[PDB]
Amino acid sequence: AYQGFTKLGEREPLNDIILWEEITPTGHSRKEYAPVASTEYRVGEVLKADGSKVAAGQEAQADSVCIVNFYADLQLSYHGQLKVVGIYRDAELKDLLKLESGVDAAAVKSALKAKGIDFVPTGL
Amino acid sequence: AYQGFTKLGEREPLNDIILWEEITPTGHSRKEYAPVASTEYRVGEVLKADGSKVAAGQEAQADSVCIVNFYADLQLSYHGQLKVVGIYRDAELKDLLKLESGVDAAAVKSALKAKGIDFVPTGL
Amino acid sequence: ISLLDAVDRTSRKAETSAPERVRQISFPMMYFKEVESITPDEIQGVRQPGTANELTTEAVVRAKKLMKIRTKFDITREFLFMQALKGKVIDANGVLYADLYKQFDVTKKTIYFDLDNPNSDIDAHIEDLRMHMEDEAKTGTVINGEEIHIVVDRTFFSKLIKHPKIRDAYLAQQTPLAWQQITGSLRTGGTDGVQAHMNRFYYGGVVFVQYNGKFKDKRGKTHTLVSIDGVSDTNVGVGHAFPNVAMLGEANNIFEVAYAPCPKMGYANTLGQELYVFEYEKDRDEGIDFEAHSYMLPYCTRPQLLVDVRSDAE
Amino acid sequence: SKLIKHPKIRDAYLAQQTPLAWQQITGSLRTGGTDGVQAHMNRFYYGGVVFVQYNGKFKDKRGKTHTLVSIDGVSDTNVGVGHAFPNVAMLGEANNIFEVAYAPCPKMGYANTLGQELYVFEYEKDRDEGIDFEAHSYMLPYCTRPQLLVDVRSDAE
Amino acid sequence: NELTTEAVVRAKKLMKIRTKFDITREFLFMQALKGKVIDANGVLYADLYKQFD
Amino acid sequence: LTNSEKSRFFLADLTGEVQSIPNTYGYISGLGLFRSAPQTQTTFLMDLTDWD
């Protein structure tokens, strides 16, 4: 380009963060969400009960960890589904959370730990 | 989607509007512009001297007709070129013109006619 | 395409043609899941109906559960096929999955037969329906509008066969067809599931077939297969006309159904099947779990050829 | 539609036990060749003449639809229109009342030469920029006995 | 991932030209059968019936 | 077998293409009742005779 580089972005996160979950006939740890208008969802983002992301000052309202890539203006997930699904009940996840700016990570993790979600120390 | 349909878009205009052009070793009817700000150029749009699209009232300042497809995000044309090229001299194009909002064709046609650009009827 | 405009010879001016237009679309598809479980408390002590003192086994219970699951999936498949034939693929709950008319940017066509009026031109309506397919097919080949399926309900069929024009025309005939239609069985051809022979009527180059199919959902509301969403008088007849298989040829088939794999392991990125059935055992010998999956969507690539038919006047 | 609906023709044909009578009434009709979009065109037989239903239309540059079987000046939907012109066998090949003339294109080497249906010209652009094309046609059809071009209408005078 | 070719584009352009001329010829034949010859632009000032008297 | 929508690192299927060819009519031109009379000049004449 005119800047010398033409980066075309990075691959979206894959659904590999779930290490253990309560396998149940009707999805014990899976909870559906009606997507909010003009909102992009990615694997790892924390959502409130309303369906929007946890912003600064409301870490205690964390409800679930989204595990689908929604495409807003497409109104379809990356698997062609109609709704956003996040893990909220007992599960074990990798330490890969895409928290918003100014959001305390410790408060969110403590809020999710009460629900039954645990995070396994990852490495790099 | 939630609306019942999904449309990925339409193919961008192709470089088939040119019917006749004065062919010279270095090009006679073609001039290059420096792309302005974040602007989306397509084939068949009327540009000004500075390179921005013609608007309502600025019809007399019709300088050329764009013949490339430029992308603001990439800052590169659809042929991987750094600049945007238009037809400003003696040539014969088709009626396909991408005009802005509130700009009449008659003022644009006469302005381009003075520079030596002709438009042939195209129909369907 | 357009017609050329005449130009003078000496002033060597000409005309040009617009280029092509190419777009792209995509389709999401529905997922169905069904779960059933077998618990020994439903087998222990219970008595087999029709037997004096014999107890049910796990085998008979499992067989009946699997048969019910398969019948449910087949019935849902039939309902979805009919919904796709209607032009809008609406789930039994009521959510929209594929609006074929909005996706392909065409409009729905409906024809009012006006069966109540004794002076109605049934021939004119039949000709309009016949010509609509030929006009709006736009496949580039030659279309025969007589090769269509017209499926109507009980009220439309009764109104059509009892019209004074049709009956008076068929009464003054000395052909075996007229004798059969007037004084004879009107039930040639069928197996509608329940019927051994469905009602069909020959008037012109087309046939009218009466379909009584209807299903119910868990909410209890019935789902008539031959119906129009919105219109619910009892005094109007409704029908559905769709192209026959041998109208556009095997080269141009417009009715397709997709199948994609279930999200279980092993089955990632594989060719989809009609139905997946999985066997799972409860721990501590607590029973058996059953799961059935299906990931499908029926669609029509030329929704304009699906024409609706009514019995009242516009 | 109005012609086949008429009670006189319908009653004349209901009381005849012939395959033709069984065909024209409660029958398929649609006995004819292709017009371009449909396999068969409607044709009705009555009184020794044949009524053929032709429904062809085109569009010009400005989206205006040009119906082939129409009468200029009348646009009523209720009224019906039609055209009758003499058949080739009516006058024999010695009076083809129908002719189309062709004249040459205005290029060098074509002056004062018998024109043809189409002139196709291919021209290479300069440097190496592509191909140019031209198509020409200088023609006019006419009829030498226009009094035999009768048009019919479905309404009263 | 298949690119277009010059032959296909040229063939489709020529075919469109030919069918355009064919439909124009059909329209003109209909006009002649009707009694007066008028182009698609509708250049009409008088009948040809009257000038054949 | 192709890039998906809104992502570059995933895949999707094309599953063909539909076409919409316009409608062309050729009944009158197919009747063949017009006889070609090629000529050289740009204007042809005709004289009409009718005995009373």
Residue numbers in the entry:
A (entry chain K), B (entry chain M): 2 to 125
C (entry chain A): 54 to 367
D (entry chain B): 211 to 367
E (entry chain B): 106 to 158
F (entry chain B): 2 to 53
From the publication, what sentences describe this entry?
Bacteriophage Sf14 infects the human pathogen Shigella flexneri. Here, we report multiple high-resolution structures of the full Sf14 particle, including symmetric and asymmetric reconstructions of the virion capsid, empty capsid, portal region, tail, and baseplate. Sf14 virions have a spherical icosahedral capsid of 820 Å in diameter, which is connected to a long, contractile tail that is approximately 1205 Å long and an average of 235 Å in diameter, expanding to 315 Å at the baseplate. Overall, phage Sf14 appears to share some similarities to other model phages, but in different combinations: both λ- and T4-like decoration proteins, HK97-like capsid and portal proteins, T4/Mu-like tail fibers, a Mu-like baseplate, and a P2-like tail needle.
In addition to the virion capsid, we determined the structure of spontaneous empty capsids, which have a mixture of non-attached or attached tails, the latter of which are contracted or non-contracted, but contain no genome. These particles are prevalent in typical Sf14 preparations and were hypothesized to be destabilized capsids lacking at least one decoration protein. However, these proteins are still present in the empty capsids and the etiology of these particles remains elusive. We hypothesized that the large proportion of empty capsids could be due to a loss of one or both decoration proteins. However, after resolving a separate structure based on empty particles alone, we did not see observable differences in the capsid composition or conformation. Results shown here are consistent with this hypothesis, as even degraded capsids without genome still contain both decoration proteins. The gp33 decoration proteins may be serving another function, such as host attachment or particle aggregation, or they may stabilize the capsid during DNA packaging but subsequently lose the genome through weakness elsewhere.
